Amino acid sequence: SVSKANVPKIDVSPLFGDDQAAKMRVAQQIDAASRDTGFFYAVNHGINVQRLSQKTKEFHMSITPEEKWDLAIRAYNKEHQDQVRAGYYLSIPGKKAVESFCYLNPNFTPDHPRIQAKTPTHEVNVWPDETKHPGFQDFAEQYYWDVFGLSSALLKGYALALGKEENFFARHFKPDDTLASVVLIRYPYLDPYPEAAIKTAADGTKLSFEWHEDVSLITVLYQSNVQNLQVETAAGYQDIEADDTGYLINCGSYMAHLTNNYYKAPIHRVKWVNAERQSLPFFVNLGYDSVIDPFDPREPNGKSDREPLSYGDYLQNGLVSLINKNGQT
Numbered sequence: 001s002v003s004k005a006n007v008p009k010i011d012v013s014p015l016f017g018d019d020q021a022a023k024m025r026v027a028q029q030i031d032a033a034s035r036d037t038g039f040f041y042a043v044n045h046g047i048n049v050q051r052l053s054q055k056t057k058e059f060h061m062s063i064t065p066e067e068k069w070d071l072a073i074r075a076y077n078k079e080h081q082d083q084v085r086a087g088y089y090l091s092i093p094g095k096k097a098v099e100s101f102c103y104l105n106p107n108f109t110p111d112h113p114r115i116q117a118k119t120p121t122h123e124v125n126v127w128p129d130e131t132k133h134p135g136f137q138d139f140a141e142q143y144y145w146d147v148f149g150l151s152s153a154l155l156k157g158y159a160l161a162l163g164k165e166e167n168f169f170a171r172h173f174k175p176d177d178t179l180a181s182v183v184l185i186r187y188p189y190l191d192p193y194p195e196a197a198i199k200t201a202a203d204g205t206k207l208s209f210e211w212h213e214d215v216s217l218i219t220v221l222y223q224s225n226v227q228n229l230q231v232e233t234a235a236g237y238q239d240i241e242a243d244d245t246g247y248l249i250n251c252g253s254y255m256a257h258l259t260n261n262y263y264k265a266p267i268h269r270v271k272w273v274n275a276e277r278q279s280l281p282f283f284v285n286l287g288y289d290s291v292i293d294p295f296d297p298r299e300p301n302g303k304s305d306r307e308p309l310s311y312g313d314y315l316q317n318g319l320v321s322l323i324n325k326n327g328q329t
């Protein structure tokens with residue numbers, strides 16, 4: 001058998017309030033989890049995840065092949081050269097099971113200065129026809145802001161955990177310019193399930209997505225109640241239990257960089273499971289020009305021998321690298 005990973009449930013509700021002592025006690029829990037397996041479940045987060053799951057299901061199960069081509073990113077549709085990040089990521093029956101829809105900051109409108117400048121990693125979202133998907137765009141945009149709010153609170157906890165003032169990360173995480181993304185991933189039930197869509201780890205474990213570190217500051221994830229994630233620890237890969245009432249939180253490699261690996265970006269992978277399920281990550285990305293000076297909370301003077309890295313450089317490079325390593329999703 002595989003051992004269960006220690007993934008504590010942390011009540012993050014104090015991070016929304018003004019009880020500074022209570023917030024420090026939450027920060028300690030975040031610190032402990034970040035130094036151990038690198039994962040925790042945020043609970044009492046205030047988001048209606050059942051409704052998220054329902055609205056997402058309605059979308060995934062009603063969108064048609066025609067609509068998927070019309071929304072497709074450039075990896076699937078050469079006509080859509082501006083869609084690198086935002087849009088539909090098609091399945092390939094017989095070969096690739098997973099499919100998804102990615103959207104960015106709703107404030108990235110045609111008149112946004114970064115869109116006007118054609119700055120890499122900024123795109124205007126694409127949406128299905130309102131009549132075919134009533135309420136979907138409005139729901140999805142509101143969800144962006146709901147999970148943005150949770151993420152801002154979590155970033156206050158991480159800042160306090162690292163010995164900083166609570167706005168240390170959050171001051172770089174702004175509605176007008178965040179590069180954060182939501183991905184609505186559908187993992188299907190298939191009978192038969194094509195072997196070509198199943199990868200095999202060195203240890204024999206059947207996978208849907210190979211080992212990686214996240215391209216993010218932190219990742220704020222909702223998934224269905226079907227166990228699938230594994231984290232590499234000193235004791236080997238361990239199973240992360242599912243909890244469809246909480247958000248699974250972990251650091252990405254930008255946090256590892258900033259903290260000189262005090263908070264590592266945990267290596268994790270997705271087991272193959274033949275089950276109809278959802279994986280709905282929010283990747284907490286900063287602004288394109290955001291630079292946080294790296295530091296080291298294990299060193300008396302706090303200094304690090306790492307060089308400052310702008311978030312935009314980090315993100316553009318990381319997303320390409322992840323595609324090269326683990327494939328176009």
Ligand SMILES: CC1([C@@H](NC(=O)[C@H](CS)NC(=O)CCC[C@H](N)C(=O)O)C(=O)O)CC1
Nearest residue numbers: 085102181185209214221270279281283329
């Ligand atoms: C592990 C998990 C998901 N995998 C993923 O989402 C994987 C590894 S974290 N992530 C990516 O491919 C990066 C997608 C970035 C997105 N297009 C953007 O432009 O911002 C899965 O396979 O379920 C939930 C996050």
Ligand SMILES: [Fe+2]
Nearest residue numbers: 212213214268
């Ligand atoms: Fe990941």
